Each structure stands twice: as structure tokens, then as C-alpha cells.
Design an enzyme around this catalytic site. Structure first.
Site, PDB file in Angstrom:
ATOM      1  CB  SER A  12      -0.828   0.035   1.044  1.00  0.00           C
ATOM      2  OG  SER A  12      -1.969  -1.071   0.903  1.00  0.00           O
TER       3      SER A  12
ATOM      4  NE  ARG B 236      -2.243   4.801   0.459  1.00  0.00           N
ATOM      5  CZ  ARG B 236      -2.917   3.779   0.421  1.00  0.00           C
ATOM      6  NH1 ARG B 236      -2.499   2.913  -0.254  1.00  0.00           N
ATOM      7  NH2 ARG B 236      -4.434   3.769   0.428  1.00  0.00           N
TER       8      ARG B 236
ATOM      9  CD  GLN C  38      -7.600  -0.493  -3.338  1.00  0.00           C
ATOM     10  OE1 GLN C  38      -7.691  -0.463  -4.637  1.00  0.00           O
ATOM     11  NE2 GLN C  38      -7.139  -1.261  -2.735  1.00  0.00           N
TER      12      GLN C  38
ATOM     13  CB  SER D 177     -10.039   0.289   4.491  1.00  0.00           C
ATOM     14  OG  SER D 177     -10.436  -1.037   4.119  1.00  0.00           O
TER      15      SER D 177
ATOM     16  CD  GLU E 115      -4.330  -5.045   4.087  1.00  0.00           C
ATOM     17  OE1 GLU E 115      -4.357  -4.813   2.907  1.00  0.00           O
ATOM     18  OE2 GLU E 115      -3.373  -4.444   4.891  1.00  0.00           O
TER      19      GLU E 115
ATOM     20  NE  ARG F  86      -8.609 -11.470   0.285  1.00  0.00           N
ATOM     21  CZ  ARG F  86      -7.723 -10.437   0.440  1.00  0.00           C
ATOM     22  NH1 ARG F  86      -8.045  -9.576   1.312  1.00  0.00           N
ATOM     23  NH2 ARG F  86      -6.514 -10.619  -0.214  1.00  0.00           N
TER      24      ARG F  86
ATOM     25  CE  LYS G 112      -3.766  -8.786  -5.604  1.00  0.00           C
ATOM     26  NZ  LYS G 112      -3.906  -7.652  -4.855  1.00  0.00           N
TER      27      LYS G 112
HETATM   28  O1  LIG Z   1      -5.568   1.676  -0.527  1.00  0.00           O
HETATM   29  C1  LIG Z   1      -4.981   0.464  -0.264  1.00  0.00           C
HETATM   30  O2  LIG Z   1      -3.967   0.193  -0.480  1.00  0.00           O
HETATM   31  C2  LIG Z   1      -5.856  -0.719   0.236  1.00  0.00           C
HETATM   32  C3  LIG Z   1      -6.893  -0.477   0.828  1.00  0.00           C
HETATM   33  C4  LIG Z   1      -8.051  -1.475   1.308  1.00  0.00           C
HETATM   34  O3  LIG Z   1      -8.846  -1.672   0.306  1.00  0.00           O
HETATM   35  P1  LIG Z   1     -11.010  -1.692   0.477  1.00  0.00           P
HETATM   36  O4  LIG Z   1     -10.997  -0.509   1.284  1.00  0.00           O
HETATM   37  O5  LIG Z   1     -11.035  -1.817  -0.764  1.00  0.00           O
HETATM   38  O6  LIG Z   1     -10.691  -2.917   1.455  1.00  0.00           O
HETATM   39  C5  LIG Z   1      -7.127  -2.975   1.739  1.00  0.00           C
HETATM   40  O7  LIG Z   1      -7.966  -3.767   2.057  1.00  0.00           O
HETATM   41  C6  LIG Z   1      -6.356  -3.128   0.396  1.00  0.00           C
HETATM   42  O8  LIG Z   1      -5.638  -4.453   0.429  1.00  0.00           O
HETATM   43  C7  LIG Z   1      -5.154  -2.037   0.270  1.00  0.00           C
END
Ligand SMILES: O=C(O)C1=C[C@@H](OP(=O)(O)O)[C@@H](O)[C@H](O)C1
Length: 424
Positions: free
Chosen positions: A24, A28, A169, A196, A311, A344, A410
């Protein structure tokens, strides 16, 4: 494809483990480095970058947009301009961060860019972000993969309202590029259930490190002022979500695992993670710039809200399956995991019950009753975290094999080796 047998731990695991960079944070950093470079501020370097399929997709996506990304190991340098060639086509793979963070970035260019991804990625949420880009003036052909962003070199920005209940996201993706919209951006999440929160906060924190002004003082709303994105050197933390798979080995075997380079102050949800481990009576200590976790002699069932850290569900589900016999554990707040790499909640349910366990999907999560398990084939669904959950189970159940451990590429291509080295 040969299966991968999950090694057992007939005695407490004892190990020191180094996991590679945060996916993540790396992705970014790559987007922000690209904006700085596209803005004419120069090259940026990201140190300790994760090298994995998701970050290779991101850097190939930036190269598809015209940028240059150098580096053969964990040090990546971003430079150049957004200047996509005719017929430019970003491959999103199964990387949500590419699928969600790169189409805004790409509306800055003056040539359209097509987005495509794995067959399995086409079942993941994306339409709300594309409607939002259209509301901000961007022509977008398509409401799902493949779709084309037909930029004309600029994106006016403004105010936009979006349902981001399916994925944080959607918010992060808009926030990262907003400083380059003429007017910046005000983004409003409508309704509730925004998953998240730590990953949106991650975005805001890294934007401020790049000198961008973002106001997040009101829940469900973010205001980003137009302005420069600084070219700077990024220092990437270890991926703490991947660290949990290894720490779980200490938890289920009564052993001791140390993770090197753990940040005492992190842009990741470290406090949520350490609290959860302590819910199971693991002893957690910070020592020698490392994190040490000592597992309990056993643990019972637990209830845990994973809304802010969804996650973690595959690893935490595995821990729940391995609690003392007859224990019941409830994982909640994670309806949105139906839209992840795979569904999941269905997958975890399916694979645990195949091993003889008892996992019931609920409208927002899972209820798991610990029961004796048996050998089987724990099937990855092309999902790195399903694959590592299988490894965790196998620590305590002989005869468990993961069909596709290579799914771990991944975010952790070296998992099989690191895991073997840990269990020994
Ligand atoms: O912005 C990020 O890097 C992510 C945010 C989350 O997404 P969700 O809010 O779609 O779960 C997380 O679960 C993903 O593995 C990484």
C-alpha cells in the site's frame, strides 16, 4: 501445477523474520512520485520498495503513461512526464491499487488510456469511481474493465460525492491526484459503512509528506487544495499485514517470532494489528527496532471487528479455526470483502469447511467454531492472503497443501522461502 505442502510445527516456532516493503505504501509512493515528475519537480527515489506483482503492475502502469521507473531491487526511481503513446493500455492485473489509483492520474495526460485487468479483476467494484471521474469532467468509456479514460491534458476538479462503501480505494484514488486538478477537489463519501479508514488516512499522511494540503477534519469528507507535489525520497516500511501471517505462527504454536524493522510509529494500522494479537493473549513487545510476539499456550474464541483492517481477515480466520476445540469466534464489519481479490468470505468458508471445520458466512463476516480439522487441498483463488491462511492452518494440521502458493507473488514473491526458513 504442483501443490505446496504447508509445513507443520510439532513444536513452537522460533524465528526472526524480515518481510519486504508495504504494498500500500509503495504504490502510493509511486503515484506521488509520478505526479511530482509529471509536474516538472524532478526524479524521486523510493527506498525499501516492495517488489511484487502488485507493485510491478503499478510501475508498468506508470511506464505505460510515459514515465520512467528504474531499479532492479528495492530502490526505485521515478522520472519523466505523463505522455502516453497511441493505444496506451494499462494492465491492472488483480491490483486494486492500480485499477483505482491510476485512472485519475491518467486523466492528466492528453491522450486516452485503456484499462484492462485479469478476468478475475473484472468482478471487482470500480463503477462508482468512474462515475465520479465523469462528474469531474473526464470522458470515460465503459463502466467496468476494460474502460478507457480519454484525457485532454487537464482535469478541472471541484466537488464530488461518491458511494465508497465498496472500497476505500475509491477515495484514496481520487485524493492522490487531486492536488493537480485546477481547483483541487472536495470529496464526499455519502451514506455510511466506509471500510479501511487507516488506508485513507495513509493516503492523507503521505500527501502531507509531499507537501499537499488536505483537510480531513470532518468524517466522510476530504478537501485537497490544488498545489505542487514535492519530489522527495520515500522510505518504505515493512508490510505489517504480511508480517501478521508470520506472527500468527508464533500465536498458534506457542512460539516466538520477531519481525525486523517494525516502525514504532507507522503510516500503517499497526495499533489495530497489535491489539488484535493481544486479544488472543499473545505477549507483544517492541525490542531492538524489532517486534517480538510470544504466543500463548492456547487461546479460546474471540470476537473481532475487522472493518478498519479487513485485509487481515484470511489470517485471522485461520487463527480462529485453530482456537481451542469448541471455541466460537466472530469476525465482523467485513461485508466489503465480498469484493476483494476473490470473495474472501465465501472462499474462507468453503476452504475451512473442506478441512472439516465449521465456518458460517454472515451478512458482514464469519462465525467460526473451532473443530478438529483434517488433511486437504487449500485452494488459493489466485489470492495471496488465502494462500498464506492455508500456510497458517497447515502449521497445526498435517496433510494440508495449498494448490497455488505462487499466488503469494501479489505482495510477497519470496513467501515460500521465508516461510520455510521460519518454520525451519
Ligand atoms: O488503499 C490500499 O492500499 C488498500 C486499501 C484496502 O482496500 P478496501 O478498502 O477496498 O478493502 C485494503 O483492503 C487493500 O488491501 C489495500
Amino acid at each position: 501445477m504442483k501443490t505446496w505442502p504447508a509445513p507443520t510445527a510439532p513444536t513452537p516456532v522460533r524465528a526472526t523474520v524480515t518481510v519486504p516493503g508495504s504494498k500500500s505504501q509503495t504504490n502510493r509512493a509511486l503515484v506521488l512520485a509520478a505526479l511530482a515528475a509529471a509536474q516538472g519537480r524532478g526524479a524521486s527515489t523510493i527506498s525499501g520498495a516492495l517488489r511484487s506483482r502488485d507493485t510491478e503492475l503499478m510501475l508498468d502502469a506508470l511506464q505505460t503513461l510515459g514515465l520512467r521507473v528504474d531499479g532492479v531491487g528495492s530502490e526505485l526511481t521515478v522520472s519523466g512526464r505523463i505522455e502516453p503513446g497511441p493505444g496506451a493500455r494499462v494492465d491492472c492485473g488483480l491490483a486494486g491499487t492500480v485499477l483505482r489509483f491510476v485512472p485519475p492520474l491518467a486523466a492528466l495526460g492528453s491522450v486516452p488510456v485503456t484499462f484492462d485487468g485479469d478476468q478475475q479483476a473484472r468482478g471487482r467494484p470500480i463503477a462508482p469511481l468512474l462515475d465520479a471521474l465523469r462528474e469531474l469532467g473526464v470522458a470515460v468509456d465503459g463502466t467496468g474493465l476494460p474502460f478507457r479514460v480519454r484525457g485532454n491534458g487537464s482535469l478541472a476538479g471541484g466537488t464530488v460525492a461518491i458511494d465508497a462503501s465498496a472500497s476505500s480505494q475509491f477515495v484514496s484514488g481520487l485524493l492522490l491526484s487531486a492536488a493537480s486538478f485546477t481547483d483541487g477537489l472536495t470529496v464526499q463519501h455519502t451514506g455510511s459503512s466506509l471500510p479501511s479508514a487507516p488506508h485513507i488516512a495513509m493516503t492523507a499522511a503521505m500527501l502531507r509528506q509531499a507537501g499537499v494540503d488536505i483537510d480531513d477534519s470532518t468524517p466522510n469528507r476530504w478537501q485537497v487544495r490544488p498545489g505542487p507535489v514535492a519530489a522527495r525520497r520515500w522510505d518504505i516500511e515493512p508490510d505489517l499485514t504480511n508480517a501478521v501471517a508470520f506472527l500468527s505462527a508464533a500465536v498458534v504454536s506457542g512460539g516466538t517470532v520477531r519481525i525486523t524493522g517494525w516502525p514504532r510509529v507507522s503510516v500503517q494500522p499497526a495499533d489495530h494489528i497489535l491489539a488484535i494479537l493481544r486479544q488472543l493473549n499473545a505477549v507483544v513487545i517492541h525490542a531492538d527496532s524489532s517486534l517480538e510476539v510470544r504466543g500463548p499456550t492456547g487461546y479460546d474464541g474471540f470476537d473481532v471487528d475487522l472493518r478498519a483492517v479487513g485485509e487481515l481477515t484470511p489470517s485471522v480466520a485461520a487463527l480462529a479455526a485453530l482456537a481451542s476445540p469448541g471455541s466460537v469466534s466472530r469476525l465482523s464489519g467485513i461485508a466489503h470483502l465480498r469484493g476483494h481479490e476473490t470473495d474472501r468470505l465465501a472462499a474462507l468458508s468453503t476452504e475451512i469447511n473442506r478441512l472439516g471445520g465449521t465456518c458460517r458466512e454472515t451478512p458482514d463476516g464469519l462465525v467460526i467454531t473451532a473443530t478438529p480439522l483434517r488433511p486437504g487441498i487449500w485452494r488459493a483463488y489466485a489470492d495471496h492472503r488465502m494462500a498464506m491462511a492455508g500456510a497458517i492452518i497447515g502449521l497445526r494440521v498435517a496433510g494440508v497443501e495449498v494448490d497455488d502458493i505462487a499466488a503469494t507473488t501479489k505482495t510477497l514473491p519470496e513467501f515460500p522461502r521465508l516461510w520455510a526458513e521460519m518454520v525451519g
